Amino acid sequence: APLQLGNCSVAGWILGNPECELLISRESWSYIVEKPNPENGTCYPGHFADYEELREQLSSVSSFERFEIFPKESSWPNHTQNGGSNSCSHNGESSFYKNLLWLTKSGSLYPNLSKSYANNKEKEVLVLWGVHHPPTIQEQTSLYVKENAYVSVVSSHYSRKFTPEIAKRPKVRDQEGRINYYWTLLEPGDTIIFEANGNLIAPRYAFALSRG
């Protein structure tokens, strides 16, 4: 049976655009019903890497389970959670993606972070995250203290280092910075490692699924 996304795009649904919350829960589906120009997608602008592939891999799913891979209340004792954005407003108030967590400095430091997850389930786990690129060096230091940060994401079948590039993009939804979104499928028995000293839009909810 088709997956009805209403006014949301796959990106808005899978990242957890706050306006995509009322979507009814589904454990299986075949074919995703998406409008030609969905109103609610990447509310904070950025590049969604490998997006068409992700759309194809999620077109038919037999089992789908969202779980809190990095629980908000216990995973980030050394960092704060940003106030989100007006670009991702819900009910006239600034908010952010439900499935991601915008980490910011705690006090005068953004401490180095290392967070890992072992796929204890017997299904593949879809993990999503982002990398923030501020428009100015003032916003970079205001949020993350250090001027030159890195993000590192490594599994047994994934390894990538991300470097924020500070510059004004054309304004999109009143935002000249960007958050680039990435994902990988974590096979059972594999471990994913997140390392960063700034600019990490951390996973909060991941998805254990069986494709096809």
């Epitope: 990447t42 602008p45 950025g46 510059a167 004004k168 054309p170 999109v172």
Partner: antibody
């Protein structure tokens, strides 16, 4: 913030090579996120995109001009240039240099120049 | 230059305070990869609208962009004398980038 200034207007002899330079102030031409572009407007016609160049080595020139076009970046002067060989009167135009910011969610690579110079007029004449 | 960008009209005249709409139609679907430029005599062309509908910093809110696919609209509400210019759409979907032929907006007074 960023300022772009094309080289002075003037003449090129037919079949010779047009050389223009764009002076950049406010950012480095070596930055990985910025691309540098040339556009031209012949008299009484519209805009024609010529191409872009990244410092990292990525370039793309309009197939209508690809064989005649060479762009380069001068990090010592913080400038970038356009060379156009074998010019004819069809190449008489105002030439604009411009900067864009790589933004793959909303633009093809190197395809959205959002800070332009005011342009310089090149006349092909003997 | 394979994606042809066709603007309509090629020139128009309107009074101060009028609502002005300019249409741009690509020869194929370009999703939202569509920008609008303003070009005043002797001045650098200016990006007003980015990716079909995003107003750029410092541009008066009387300018707006809408559309997707094969139909796009630039709207100037409450036309002002300083809005005399030629307006171009530009597609960023395929290389090479291509511009519309331009729309000259004149002021009726």
């Amino acid at each position: 913030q960023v300022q772009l200034e094309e080289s002075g207007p003037g003449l090129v002899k037919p079949s010779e090579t047009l050389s223009l330079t764009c002076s950049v102030s406010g950012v480095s031409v070596t930055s990985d996120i910025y691309y540098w572009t040339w556009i031209r407007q012949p008299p009484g016609k519209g805009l024609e995109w010529i191409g872009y160049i990244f410092y990292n080595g990525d370039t793309n020139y309009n197939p209508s001009l690809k064989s005649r076009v060479t762009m380069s970046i001068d990090t010592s002067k913080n400038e970038f240039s356009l060379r156009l060989t074998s010019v004819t009167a069809a190449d008489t135009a105002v030439y604009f240099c411009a900067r864009g910011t790589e933004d793959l969610g909303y633009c093809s690579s190197g395809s959205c120049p959002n800070h332009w110079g005011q342009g310089t007029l090149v006349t092909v004449s003997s | 230059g394979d994606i042809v960008m066709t603007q309509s009209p090629s020139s128009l005249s309107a009074s101060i305070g009028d609502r002005v709409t300019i249409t741009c139609r690509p020869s194929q679907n370009i999703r939202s990869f569509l920008n609008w430029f303003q070009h005043k005599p002797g001045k650098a062309p200016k990006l007003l609208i980015y990716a079909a509908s995003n107003l750029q910093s410092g541009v008066p809110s009387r300018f707006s962009g809408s559309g997707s696919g094969t139909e796009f609209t630039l709207t100037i509400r409450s036309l002002q004398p300083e809005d005399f210019a030629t307006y171009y759409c530009q597609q960023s979907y395929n290389t090479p980038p291509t511009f519309g032929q331009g729309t000259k907006v004149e002021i009726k007074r």
